Amino acid sequence: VERDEVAAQKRELEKQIERLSQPSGAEDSRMIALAERFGGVLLSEIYDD
Amino acid sequence: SSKSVANIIRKTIQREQNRIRMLNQGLQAVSFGQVRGVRLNVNVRESHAI
Secondary structure, eight states: OHHHHHHHHHHHHHHHHHHTTTTTTSSHHHHHHHHHTTTOOOHHHHTOO | OHHHHHHHHHHHHHHHHHHHHHHHGGGSSOOBTTBOOOOOOOOOOHHHHO
């Protein structure tokens, strides 16, 4: 039980880490295709710096 | 990291193509002998695109 609880916490941590990964950490699940399919740029990336 | 490398290569290629296309506009309609225009053709090699 302790192992499974720790594993759930772990999985949440890696999911959170991944969500910030690429191309610039955002809702990249579909934001990617939604972004390159149209000649636009992510606002968060625009304000990246 | 590999995905990021690929994306940055693609972005740089697009930017350079845009810049070269912009520069190309100034050489339109240059009359030299039978020559009437000059272009810098930029392309992505298939052997590297794949």
